[PDB]
Amino acid sequence: GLLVRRRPATKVLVNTVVPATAEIAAALGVAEDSEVHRIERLRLTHGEPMAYLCNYLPPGLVDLDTGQLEATGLYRLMRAAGITLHSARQSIGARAATSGEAERLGEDAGAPLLTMERTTFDDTGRAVEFGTHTYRPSRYSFEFQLLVRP
């Protein structure tokens, strides 16, 4: 079996409620146009922008107060509200940035970005969080160790 070990400042840009598109509904297992929470954060290191984090949560899970979010990570907050985080599904990829995300991060439109999409589930196998993220490749990379564990 394969065990894993993974090898900044946060500013909230969006804290809203929104109807689920098909992609979001699919990820979270809710109905299209049902309401979900949309959060957007910029993460900076040494005052420079590192990553752009968009997250979607299903209704009635957590109190999403902007501010709490600038203090601690989203997972810590969720556990704090007594959500159990049991697994996550992840895909890591790369894209040319469109004008929007290129601006938010301080980069030219078309410049390569590191992307990742994640869905997080609880004890009962329900999606609890869906994230769609971009990272400045000159500023960030996914670092981990894989271990064969008896």
Place this chain on the structure above:
Amino acid sequence: GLLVRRRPATKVLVNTVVPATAEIAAALGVAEDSEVHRIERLRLTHGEPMAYLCNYLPPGLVDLDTGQLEATGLYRLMRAAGITLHSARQSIGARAATSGEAERLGEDAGAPLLTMERTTFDDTGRAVEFGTHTYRPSRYSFEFQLLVRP
């Protein structure tokens, strides 16, 4: 603790012996300019190029016959020669492709590529393999599941 589960055709382009640069020596724990094996593979899916794989092995580990390499994966071959693979260190990133890798893969110079670097160690904690890879982001992504395991 965090367990992990991961969610083509191969053509050998280079099978050679080469002096270690500082980067390669560092990864593998050998001396600069000491000799290492350099392998290069193109992986294709449906006859289209998916990834460009450069690997370096320290001397006297495996018989690296081109051909065997078009049949099976590099890890299987190494285990086959009785190497124990115990862990690996990985970093995943993104780059604009330079003319070289852009050509090899069928892409314009500057087009975003998915990159990954990996070092693999055996039972005794020695590097056994160092890989430096590129992936066409429209053709590939890193897919996995993370599990909290009692």
